[PDB]
Amino acid sequence: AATATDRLKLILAKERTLNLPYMEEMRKEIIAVIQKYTKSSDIHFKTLQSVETIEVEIILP
Amino acid sequence: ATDRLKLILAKERTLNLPYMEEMRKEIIAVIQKYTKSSDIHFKTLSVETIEVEIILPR
């Protein structure tokens, strides 16, 4: 319903064309930081215009 | 013209998160650690969203 379970959402957008070989490493660390301050353990992260959005859904404790 | 990056951290504005703004700080740090970007813009806008637009330097 419109009440139980607190979520947090993180989006990382970039040029689909762009290189950046560390995106992964960055993803991992970014998530690591969130878990640190939110103590969350339920984390969902998927990838997909021509913009690419690493989407990350985080359920708070 | 310029290669940008953008990040959104969204939450329900009601919800009380003492640590927001710390996460923001830290998270930016990580991004800088990896992008080395000297240019960063963050603003806060039912749903509170923290947006960080980042300009890559390389």
Numbering used by the authors:
A (entry chain A): 13 to 60, 64 to 76
B (entry chain B): 16 to 60, 65 to 77
Sentences reproduced from the published study:
MinE has two structurally and functionally distinct domains: the anti-MinCD domain and the topological specificity domain (TSD). In contrast, the anti-MinCD domain of EcMinE (residues 1–31) interacts with MinD and induces the dissociation of the MinCD complex, thereby blocking the inhibitory action of MinC on cell division. Here we report the crystal structure of full-length Helicobacter pylori MinE (HpMinE) and redefine the TSD of HpMinE based on that structure. Remarkably, we found that the N-terminal region of the TSD (residues 19–26), which was previously defined as part of the anti-MinCD domain, forms a β-strand (βA) that participates in TSD folding, and HpMinE forms a dimer through the interaction of anti-parallel βA-strands.
The crystal structure of full-length HpMinE was solved using the multi-wavelength anomalous dispersion (MAD) method and refined to an Rwork = 26.2% and Rfree = 29.6% at 2.8 Å resolution. Two monomers were observed in an asymmetric unit; they formed a homodimeric α/β structure with an upper surface (the α-face) consisting of α-helix and a lower surface (the β-face) consisting of an anti-parallel twisted β-sheet. The extensive hydrophobic dimer interface subsumed about 1100 Å2 of surface area (22.8% of the total surface area), and size exclusion chromatography showed that HpMinE forms a stable dimer in solution (data not shown). Each monomer is composed of a long helix αA (residues 35–50) and a three-stranded anti-parallel β-sheet comprised of βA (residues 19–26), βB (residues 54–59) and βC (residues 67–74). The N-terminus of HpMinE (residues 1–12 in MolA; residues 1–15 in MolB) was disordered and invisible within the crystal structure. Within the crystal packing, HpMinE forms the spiral structure with 12 protomers per turn generated by the sixfold symmetry. The formation of the polymeric structure is entirely attributable to the dimer–dimer interaction mediated by the anti-parallel βB-strand. To further analyse the dimer–dimer interaction observed in the crystal structure of native HpMinE, we compared the crystal structures of HpMinE crystallized in two different space groups. Native and Se-Met-labelled crystals of HpMinE were crystallized in the P64 and P65 space groups respectively. The conformation of the dimer was well conserved in the two crystal forms, but the dimer–dimer interaction began to deviate in the tetramer formation, and the packing was tilted about 24° in hexamers.
